[PDB]
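Milestone 3.1: sequence recovery, worked example.
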């Protein structure tokens, strides 16, 4: 009395090298399939961009994603193995595909599926910080680091995803919630801290309903910042808001993270401070004694020039520049 049917029937056109296409995930900007590279035999992930040239905004974002992926060459940062288009000429150019190493899962699902002891947590945070140090050395800020953006394979190797293209705010720095200061690289550090805390205790550290509730939950732990920090804020609304907050003392992280080693508590105390200038950088965090047991952790990477991304272009010009990028691979 019933019949089965596939309802989403999207069509892919990929190089003959990649065999065994299998869906993995979807997204607003593209869909991902697993495949096997016939040459090396390695497992790869192929992302088909979702209508990249339906609008000038989508085209700009696809071009920036492509250039960011081409620029980064680090083991803890997702990179490009290949880029291709099935279209034969520029006038027919409508779809292009990105090829990346295949990661079995992301840290978000892993936190609910797997036991994460001290050693695996240490290694994962270690890889996060190395990838972040590489990204920051290139002058790029992730700005939206979360467990879903951290891919992990079977070897506990980690890669950062969706960087520079800026669930939503439990891992956002306080300067991102209120937009009260110019963003620095250390915003990503805050995210790591949150993630690391959630890795240790198994509970979201700062889980708020609305934005102001997020800041309430944050300052319950960090305490109110000194008035001097409030006077250096750029936003006037945030300044007036922080003025009228009742005084709150800093809570001891050992009481918060009851099942954390002293070194973990120390590193987290240096990561989760309200003033971004007082936060350790990725390199300083990597030098913490918490990572002493791991092999030593500057990257020589060219500064990323975003001027080419900000050139005002028509859709035809976006298609031509993206086509050149695709063919230049």
């Amino acid at each position: 009395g019933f019949y089965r049917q596939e309802v989403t029937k999207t069509a892919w056109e990929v190089r003959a090298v990649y065999r065994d296409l299998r869906p993995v995930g979807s997204g607003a900007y593209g869909a991902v399939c697993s495949a096997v590279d016939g040459r090396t035999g390695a497992k790869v992930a192929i992302k088909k961009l979702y209508r990249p040239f339906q609008s000038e905004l989508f085209a700009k974002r696809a071009y920036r994603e492509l250039r960011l992926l081409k620029h980064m060459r680090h083991e803890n940062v997702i990179g490009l193995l290949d880029v291709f288009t099935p279209d034969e000429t520029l006038d027919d150019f409508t779809d292009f595909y990105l090829v990346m190493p295949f990661m079995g899962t992301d840290l978000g699902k892993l936190m609910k599926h797997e036991k994460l002891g001290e050693d695996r947590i240490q290694f994962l945070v270690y890889q996060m910080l190395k990838g972040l140090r590489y990204i920051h050395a290139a002058g790029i800020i992730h700005r939206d680091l979360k467990p879903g953006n951290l891919a992990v394979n079977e070897d506990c190797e980690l890669k950062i995803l969706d960087f520079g293209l800026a669930v939503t705010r439990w891992y956002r720095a306080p300067e991102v919630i209120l937009n009260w200061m110019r963003y620095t690289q250390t915003v990503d550090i805050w995210s790591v801290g949150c993630i690391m805390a959630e890795m240790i205790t198994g509970k979201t550290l700062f889980k708020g309903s609305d934005h102001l509730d997020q800041l309430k939950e944050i300052m319950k732990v960090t305490g109110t910042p000194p008035a001097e920090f409030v006077q250096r804020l750029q936003s006037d609304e945030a300044k007036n808001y922080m003025k009228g907050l009742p005084e709150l003392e800093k809570k001891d992280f050992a009481s918060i993270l009851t099942n954390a080693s002293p070194l973990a508590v120390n590193l987290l105390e240096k990561m989760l401070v309200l003033d971004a200038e007082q936060r350790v950088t990725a390199g300083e965090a990597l030098a913490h004694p918490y990572f002493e047991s791991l092999h030593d952790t500057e990257p020589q990477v060219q500064k990323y020039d975003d001027s080419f991304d900000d050139v005002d272009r028509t859709l035809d010009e976006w298609k031509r520049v993206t086509y050149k990028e695709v063919l230049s691979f």
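The beta strands are 18-25, 30-37, 43-49, 82-84, 97-101, 105-106, 150-152, 158-160. The radius of gyration is 22 Å.
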